[PDB]
Every structure is written in structure tokens, then in C-alpha cells.
Structure 1
């Protein structure tokens, strides 16, 4: 039930901690369907090297070792990813005007991401450091049988002002929210097995408008 989950758990969690974990979000059947769809995308060569906002002399693989593709939710064979995305959107809509001072009106497409084992990860970073509009990061994990003590892949967040950092294992059917800005620097520790996630970034209307203005004027 979106209303209660959003207003009585996600909103207070986000406003107090900037991080919110919802375990067993969709159930095993839907999570497994999503996993099959993601593995189909992988198996048919859809993934490409993850990119960075600003590219410079260094290789992107020195920064993030994952391969990704962008999904709208209506593509053939991505119907359950679409259901995931719609459920995400429903929760966010039910939090309207209650997540900080943001006014969330839109989001990116879904980034389906794979770290292909071999110790790939993502160096310490901030998702939105310079105000490109992203205010909330939403991640769904679908790694059945993952044992993070052996296979790694832990998301470590350093929430600002906290006495402890937050370790999030990429558990099957886990949903995660956190502020995208500098309050939550984070890293994806090296993965030694194939690690899948689906990420959407939700936009604050005003910040996103300013970012687009900066882009469209050079």
C-alpha cells in the first residue's frame, strides 16, 4: 500500500536520515521476473560502459566498472521492469511535497546496471554534486543468492553528519532511497560475482529547470 508506506515510513526515514531501505518490495515472483528480463538484456548485448557527467583524460572504467542500458518501461521484454518503475513512481507521487522542500515532477529513465564480477566497482562519488536536478536516488536490487561477505558489492554511504556509515547489501527485492546530493557520498565496493541493479533518479522541478537552462545556453 503506497500511501502508508510513503507517509509513515519513507518520508520520515528520508527526512531524518537521508536513506531509506524497503525490503521485500515486490515479492519473489516479480523480483525473479525482473531478474530474467535484466539477464535477457545482458545476454543480448544491450549493456555498454557506464559513463560520467564530465568526461576528461581518464577512462570511465577507472571510475565505474559497470555496464548499463536505459529502459523506459514499455519495451518488449521489459514489462516487469516497467511495473517496478511504475511502483517507484507511485511511492514518489504519494510523497509529494513531503520530501524536504523538493517538488518532484519527473525522473530519468531506468538505468539497468551490471557489475560483471571481476572486482569491478564504483569509486567514492556523489550522484549529483553540482545541481543537475537529481534529488532522490532510487535503487532496486535483484541479486538472488548474493552473499556479500564472499561476493562483495556492498554499497557504502557516508551520510553527512552521522557517526556511522551505512552499509547496504545488494539484496534481492530490496528498494533503496537516498538524497542524491553531497549529503550521501557513496561507493560500490568491488563485486566478485555478477551484480544487477535498476536505478532511477527523481528530479526536483526547480533545480532541473535551472540545470537544463545552463545546458541549453552552453
Structure 2
């Protein structure tokens, strides 16, 4: 579905209402599978880290690697990034009062599927400039009931919580600040995700006064 259409008709209305927005079958099967393969290639080649230390012979969790998008063998990933930027672009000045002028590189995360997950947290608690978190999942035929790895977010100050499964070709958007505390439940199977954070012009500008 047309980026502009999707953005104007779904992402914007949805984001400003729930602060969270899930979009299924974003790029498509062939493309999704393509991204999946490149990601896996990076894993095989050994571009990921050993994983966040969880503990002699300790247990490591999520492994990461930063992808600019033009690295050899990451064309489709670079394509997802550009496609993500396109969506945001159409949401120009539509998401909150924010004015997105930039983003970080892509963070590819891999929970090895050895029980590790990720503690409840807030992506941007100190106002480093990130206003929107964007995550793309590439796990074909994922079954949380079997492999776990659910992403649990606690939107706003509302009771209860929303559960988002790292479904294949799924794209997710959510406020990065205190409004969206979240955690990644233990994953008993390889779980890949690609994350990109979008910067708000003003918040980022005044944050620069730190380096």
C-alpha cells in the first residue's frame, strides 16, 4: 500500500491516538525474505556482537550490529531504511508537534533464542532527541506461544499493556520517551529485528549541548 496513503491514512491517525502503530506486510514476502537473508548473512559472517552480557562462561543475550544501509550485502536493508524514511517523510509535521529532521543508522538486533530477553526500559528517558522508535521484524512463521519473544509495551500511564509479536514483515512505530516503557520477553528461537530512531529537530538541537 502506497507509503503516502499508508502514512496519511494510518500511521499518522494511529500514532497521534495510541502513540503506537502496527503495520503488517509492509514490504512484502519476497522483499521480507530478502531482508531476512541479508540479516542472516550478517549473522553468519559474524558482523554481530557476542551479545549483551547477562551474567566463568557467562550467558550473553541480544547481539547487535549497526547498518548504515550502503554496506555491501545490505541493499535490501538499506532499502527498508529508505522505505522507512519515506513513510516518515510523508508524515511530515504530522506526528505530534515534532519536526523530524534526522535519524540514527539501523540497529539490527538478534536475540539468539537462548532464553535471553531485554529488561523493561525506555528508549529515550533523558531527552537525547529521539521522538519515534521504528522497528521492522523479519521472523517468518513466528509463534510466541512456542518461541516467545513478545514485545510488551506499557503505553502512557494506562493500566494493562499491549503485546506485539515480532511477526514477519511487520513494521512498528511508537513514542521513544517515557510514554512507552517496554521489554522483550525471553526468546527461545532466533529473533531478528531492525530498529531506527527518528530525531525531533528541537529536542536534538538542545541536546547537542552535552558533547
Given the two structures, how large is their TM-score scaled by the length of structure 2? 0.94
Shift of 1:50: 5.9
Work out whether residues 49 and 61 of structure 1, in 8 Å CA contact, stay in contact via their aligned partners in 2: no
Work out whether residues 53 and 61 of structure 2, in 8 Å CA contact, stay in contact via their aligned partners in 1: no
Shift of 1:66: 0.5
Shift of 1:49: 5.1
Q: Distance in 2 between matches of 1:199 and 1:60?
A: 32
Shift of 1:127: 0.2
Q: Give the one of 107, 130, 146 matched to 2:142.
A: 146
Shift of 1:64: 8.6
Q: Distance in 1 between matches of 2:60 and 2:14?
A: 28
Q: Deviations over 1:154-196 (max 9, x none)?
A: 0000001334311000000000000000000000000000000
Work out whether residues 52 and 61 of structure 2, in 8 Å CA contact, stay in contact via their aligned partners in 1: no
Work out whether residues 136 and 194 of structure 2, in 8 Å CA contact, stay in contact via their aligned partners in 1: yes
Deviates more, 1:38-47 or 1:63-72: 63-72
Cα separation, partners in 2 of 1:174 and 1:63, compared to 1, 3 Å = farther
Q: Deviations over 1:126-165 (max 9, x none)?
A: 0000000000000000001211101100000000133431
Q: Deviations over 1:88-146 (max 9, x none)?
A: 00000101111111110100000011000111110000000000000000000000121
Work out whether residues 52 and 60 of structure 1, in 8 Å CA contact, stay in contact via their aligned partners in 2: no
Question: Number of residue pairs matched?
Answer: 210
Cα separation, partners in 2 of 1:195 and 1:60, compared to 1, 3 Å = farther
Shift of 1:8: 1.1
Deviates more, 1:190-199 or 1:59-68: 59-68
Q: Deviations over 1:43-80 (max 9, x none)?
A: 11111156799xxxxx7999992110011111110000
Unpaired runs of 5+ residues, structure 2, are none
Unpaired runs of 5+ residues, structure 1, are 54-58
Cα separation, partners in 2 of 1:60 and 1:125, compared to 1, 3 Å = farther
Work out whether residues 63 and 122 of structure 1, in 8 Å CA contact, stay in contact via their aligned partners in 2: no
